[PDB]
Paper text:
The CH103 bnAb lineage, derived from patient CH505, produced several bnAbs including CH103, which target the CD4 receptor binding site (CD4bs) of the HIV-1 Env. In the CH505 patient, Env insertion mutations in V5 occurred throughout virus evolution, which reduced the potency of CH103 lineage bnAb precursors through steric interference.
The light chain mutations we introduced, Q38LV and L46LV, were based on residues found in the mature members of the lineage. To aid in crystallization, we added an additional mutation, Y32LN, in the light chain of I32M to create “I33M. Y32LN occurs during affinity maturation of the CH103 lineage and N32L first appears in the VLJL of intermediate antibody I2. Replacing leucine with the shorter valine at this position in I33M causes F100DH (Y100DH in the case of the CH103 bnAb) to swing closer to Y49L to maintain hydrophobic interactions, while P96H appears unaffected. As with the chimeric I3.1 and mature CH103 bnAb, N32L in I33M could form the same hydrogen bond with the HCDR3 loop, specifically with N100BH, which is conserved in all members of the lineage.
Residue numbers in the entry:
A (entry chain B): 2 to 9, 11 to 95, 95A, 96 to 106, 106A, 108 to 209
B (entry chain A): 1 to 82, 82A, 82B, 82C, 83 to 100, 100A, 100B, 100C, ...
Write the structure that this text describes.
């Protein structure tokens, strides 16, 4: 089980970033927030809902009530770009963490992803196995969510998705794979790759 | 000030045991629970276990059966053993300090840098290559499935075709093997006219595969 955070929050330099963390009766607990940068020690930017450790800039503030804890950054700076994780206490697993929010401080204009979806090849099907291939390219910020649909029912098994990687043109690319049995592929009318970037969702669909 | 730094092996093979150690700088091993956590796209941020200098331990119930945390106060170090690792245990592993007190107010202050641990195949394997059949354009490609280790080199028409070629970064799948795709965007005016052949070079397994990509 986990606390719910938005996968990504992108701001231009100076805008306000608001990261929410949602859970059952979270407001009755104390939430803390971790700033995680690659290659560096994570730091506590807020503990006990709203307390700011010595060393942490005044632009970071925290709030918690109802079912939602919120981290606010105000006048977001480039150096604030990181993944933020919410955290609280849990009766069963001792600690419960948020799903994480990638905060991007825009260094270029946004770009929507180009998505291409491939069905399994005949050759792969003859070798029994079956793989659907969803390719995601030229998007910015480097944050995307990929959902697979079998007909119209969400697919929960056999999805492998890469971490977005920076292309030579400073935009990002990622790819997602759905592994199926041949009968699964031949049993449904269609499969779909749903790619959500920022707020918008583009869908691609293939059929037997 | 108290500083932490983890040490790790970098790359390990599936079914093996992962061993990490944290070296504590500054103060001594008292007043703190010494903890391990890991971070990955699939696991999110997750706590593994912590230990007191007296040896008292507490583990994450989802990891308890594979995990042992130990401490050596004479060396200002504590350690993690994670057994039977699979590709799913690929993550950045962190050591951290946990202040004494009510768990309801507990949080991890002071963290190490993190150490990346990749868990992958115990053996070299060459890829299977499959065709990905196709404004006024179309996308076609090749699927390069189940190889180890990196890298793979993909070219199109022996490298004479360069415009519109995009070869994607590999995914590390749960089996501990890699897969990638190479795709090329071409004029729809082609197809039936103009041949598209992907050349896949995987030198570690001494493998080279040529696949012709055609519309069905
Ligand atoms: Cl940038």
């Amino acid at each position: 089980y986990e606390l719910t955070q938005p996968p990504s929050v992108s701001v231009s330099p100076g805008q306000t970033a608001s990261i929410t963390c949602s859970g059952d009766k979270l407001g009755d607990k104390n939430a803390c927030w971790y700033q995680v940068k690659p290659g560096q020690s994570p730091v506590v930017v807020i503990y006990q809902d709203s307390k700011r450790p010595s060393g942490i800039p005044e632009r970071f503030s925290g709030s918690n009530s109802g079912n939602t804890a919120t981290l606010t950054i105000s006048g977001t700076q480039a150096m604030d770009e990181a993944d933020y994780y919410c955290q609280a206490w849990d009766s069963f697993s001792t600690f419960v963490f948020g799903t994480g929010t990638k905060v991007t401080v825009l260094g270029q204009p946004k770009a929507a992803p180009s998505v291409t979806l491939f069905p399994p090849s005949s050759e792969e099907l003859q070798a029994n196995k079956a793989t659907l291939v969803c390719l995601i390219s030229d998007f910015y910020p480097g944050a995307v969510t990929v959902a697979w649909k079998a007909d119209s029912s969400p697919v929960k098994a056999g999805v492998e998705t890469t971490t977005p990687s920076k292309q030579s043109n400073n935009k990002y690319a990622a790819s997602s794979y759905l592994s199926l049995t041949p009968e699964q592929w031949k049993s449904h009318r269609s499969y779909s790759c749903q790619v959500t970037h920022e707020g918008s969702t583009v869908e691609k669909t293939v059929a037997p | 000030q108290v500083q932490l730094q983890e040490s790790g092996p970098g790359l390990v093979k599936s079914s093996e045991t992962l061993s990490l150690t944290c070296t504590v700088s500054g103060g001594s091993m008292g007043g703190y629970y010494w903890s391990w956590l890991r971070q990955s796209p699939v696991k999110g941020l997750e706590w593994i276990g912590y230990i007191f200098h007296t040896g008292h331990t507490n583990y994450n119930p989802s990891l308890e059966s594979r995990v042992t945390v130990s401490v050596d106060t004479s060396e200002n170090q504590f350690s993690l053993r994670l057994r039977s690792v699979t590709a799913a245990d690929t993550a950045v592993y962190y050591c951290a300090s946990l202040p004494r007190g009510q768990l309801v107010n507990a949080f991890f202050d002071n963290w190490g840098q993190g150490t990346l641990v990749t868990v992958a195949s115990a053996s070299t394997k060459g890829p299977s290559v499959f065709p990905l059949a196709p404004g006024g354009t179309a996308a076609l490609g090749c699927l390069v499935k189940d190889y180890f280790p990196e890298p793979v080199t993909v070219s199109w028409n022996s490298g004479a075709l360069t415009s519109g070629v995009h070869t994607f970064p590999a995914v590390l799948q749960s089996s501990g093997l890699y897969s990638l795709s190479s795709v090329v965007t071409v004029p729809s005016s082609s197809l039936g006219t103009q041949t598209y052949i992907c050349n896949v070079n995987h030198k570690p397994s001494n493998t080279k595969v040529d696949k012709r990509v055609e519309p069905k």
